Amino acid sequence: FDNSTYRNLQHHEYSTYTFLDLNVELSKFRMPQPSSGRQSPRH
């Protein structure tokens, strides 16, 4: 048990597309989106 070490170094290796890559990865577990019944408010 060491409380003197800051582990949080994952972000150092984060690139420009890391957030969007994680979004693409998470797109698989998502529940189907609800629909208002239109394609757009202008439809």
Binding site: S27, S36, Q39, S40
Partner: protein, 217 residues
């Protein structure tokens, strides 16, 4: 003081509706993933991320990028123009490879942020709005970045560099020029939001799960 940036667009040979812009196929996959999060019939909600995505591929936002986002999302182009001119993280002009943003708000200024600003200016030879002739750096001042405890701090292309000193800011510039990337975080042997010495609290071993659970659960 005053903003300096204009909120009208005038066509230029380098920024016109016929300036070449298109998403990469990988960026199109990412756009599909971004679009899916929102409810059907509310596709516009993706204007904020997708626009950002364009800037993450091109570097800035030419008017053709705004037109492409508007056409992809089937949103009127003036709505994308409104979004682009409202939010300050969108670059409607080219910037340097490294965008230095130094905080100068009151908590950050109280810890000698002007020393950092002058150190950057004398190290780069440019002012608080200009871009270095090598097109590597651009220096601006920004409002509170939410890293006040670590003030003075600077934000560079998604990396915070905190607890800055004039010697410290200069070295980061040297490391960025020579083709290396510097480690983000505090620069005073702190690597946290902790007190600078002693760790006044959170020294006990963390409690095990279910330690404080109430009866009947």
């Amino acid at each position: 003081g005053a903003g300096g940036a204009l909120f009208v667009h005038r066509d230029t040979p380098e920024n016109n509706p016929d300036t070449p812009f298109d998403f990469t196929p990988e960026n199109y996959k990412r756009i599909e993933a971004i679009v899916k999060n929102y409810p059907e019939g509310h596709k516009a909600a993706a204007v904020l991320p997708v626009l950002d995505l364009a800037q993450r591929q091109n570097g800035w936002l030419p008017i053709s990028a705004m037109n492409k986002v508007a056409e992809i999302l089937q949103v009127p182009p003036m709505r994308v123009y409104e979004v682009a001119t409202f939010y300050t993280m969108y670059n409607r002009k080219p910037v340097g490879k490294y965008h230095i943003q130094v905080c100068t708000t009151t908590p950050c200024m109280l810890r000698n942020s002007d020393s950092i600003l002058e150190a950057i200016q004398k190290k780069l030879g440019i002012k608080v709005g200009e871009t270095t002739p090598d097109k590597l750096f651009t220096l601006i001042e920004v409002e509170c970045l939410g890293a006040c405890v670590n003030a003075p701090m600077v934000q560079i292309n998604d990396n915070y560099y905190e607890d800055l000193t004039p010697k410290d800011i200069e070295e980061i510039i040297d490391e960025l020029k020579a083709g290396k990337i510097p480690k983000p975080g505090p620069r005073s042997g702190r690597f946290s939001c902790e007190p600078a010495g002693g760790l006044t609290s959170l020294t006990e071993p963390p409690k095990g799960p279910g330690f404080g659970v109430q009866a009947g659960l």
